[PDB]
Structure 1
């Protein structure tokens, strides 16, 4: 993998591994989300960022500032099969004072066809107090030299699926998965729970019958609070409709919300 000719985006190819496929003989949504995170880290390293979960840059590290995700939106049209080669292109962009946006384009390396696309919103915050102090003009200069100056959006459509307000799930939930805990495989270098784990936990409340008759097409997820290593999560789901669902992840005890989102599934 490497930065493109203009240095304003990053490309990388991946072969789909045998342990990365699920009950469809094709890659799982956690494999796809993991591959997005991998190409995002390699892009951050190729431009001088911190390589950890946050692409910190200088003066941000001086002020104990980190980039945290607020929203993840993934759309998949064709899940790659075992042995397939998938090319992913990622790029960074400034969203004024609110934060950053990271986009991805998934392609089949054989047919050159777009088989998926993703978008994410990142907010700036203090690593210790966790307060979203997204105020810094000189910090914006250190990352802008790596972003395309003209807008380049994976989902360009005016007021699309990635910019929709997600409501809160009313109790009782139609489907649920209680007692979900992270394991050592789900933790990073600083022992924080991987962003891809939350996606997998959201889908643990989808019934097996839906997974056996449908394929996941769209997933919009909002990150409200981070799940600690010793925390326990409850996954909630209700059919809002193709099939559509409303999701909610909360701490098993107090019922403190960590995530909320929507999923759209298609018949096979």
Structure 2
């Protein structure tokens, strides 16, 4: 992949691999989320930000990292094994709040848009996990890599007891940790989907997922995935620590019949 001509977005092509697809012989939404992260990491390296943490100079001095606050993905068509998908990504300033990253997915052959995503990322001190606002010094470091006029690819309630569906006692394995020994964010998408009934997964495709991230999760921890139907099929989701512990994630999904 590469930066585009104007230097303000990044494109990469991926050939869908055999082990990346599910029963319908199309890429899983976890594969799609991994590809979104990969093209984002390559974009960060292409402008001089990357060691596992994409950071600006002032972020590194202040022990700040970007953490996901919200992820929103819409997929029109999942690509097949051997298909070529092209993903374009870019970022925009959200003032003091944080930083937006957007993506557009295309079928490389037809040029049709097959998916879109947007995310909100916020500053966090990597040691204390306390959220911070974006200073002028940090914003000024990355603004020169962003379109400055709008370019858009486009509350979640708390699940009430009792949950309709659950998958409890979910534990990460080493494959779920990133190069910084943090639980990979895509893991959270997988954990949400684990509590969706097999009958729904067999008969429907995921069209939209929205996840809020409240509090990151850890290697030694145990997570419960809770789901209730709110309806297409529509669900409300809550990830919380084992033992009726703290909320990690809440989300919604929208599913279309096959």
Conserved in 1, the CA contact under 8 Å of 2:228 and 2:237?
Answer: yes
The structural deviation recorded for 1:54 is 3.6
Residues in 1 aligned to 2:10 and 2:139: alpha-carbon distance in whole angstroms: 20
Conserved in 2, the CA contact under 8 Å of 1:54 and 1:68?
Answer: no
The structural deviation recorded for 1:53 is 5.0
Deviations along 1:181-211, whole A, 9 cap, x unmatched?
1111111122100010000000000000001
Deviations along 1:81-102, whole A, 9 cap, x unmatched?
0100000000011011101000
Conserved in 1, the CA contact under 8 Å of 2:89 and 2:102?
Answer: yes
The structural deviation recorded for 1:253 is 2.1
Conserved in 1, the CA contact under 8 Å of 2:98 and 2:134?
Answer: no
Residues in 2 aligned to 1:4 and 1:135: alpha-carbon distance in whole angstroms: 26
The structural deviation recorded for 1:226 is 1.1
* Secondary structure in 1 matching 2:57: coil
Q: TM-score, normalised by structure 1?
A: 0.95
Q: TM-score, normalised by structure 2?
A: 0.98
Conserved in 2, the CA contact under 8 Å of 1:235 and 1:248?
Answer: yes
Conserved in 1, the CA contact under 8 Å of 2:65 and 2:126?
Answer: yes
Partner of 1:159: none
Conserved in 1, the CA contact under 8 Å of 2:49 and 2:55?
Answer: yes
Partner of 1:158: none
Deviations along 1:135-158, whole A, 9 cap, x unmatched?
411111000000001110001xxx
Between stretches 52-61 and 96-105, larger displacement belongs to 52-61
Between stretches 250-259 and 217-226, larger displacement belongs to 250-259
Deviations along 1:57-100, whole A, 9 cap, x unmatched?
10110111111110000000000001000000000110111010
Count of aligned residue pairs for this structure pair: 258
Distance change >3 Å, CA 53–CA 174, structure 1 → 2? farther
Deviations along 1:185-241, whole A, 9 cap, x unmatched?
111122100010000000000000001111000000000111100101100000001
Q: Which runs of at least 4 in structure 1 moved beyond 3 Å after TM superposition?
A: none
Residues in 1 aligned to 2:37 and 2:85: alpha-carbon distance in whole angstroms: 14
Residues in 2 aligned to 1:133 and 1:36: alpha-carbon distance in whole angstroms: 25
Structure 1: gaps of 5 or more residues: 156-164
Distance change >3 Å, CA 209–CA 183, structure 1 → 2? same
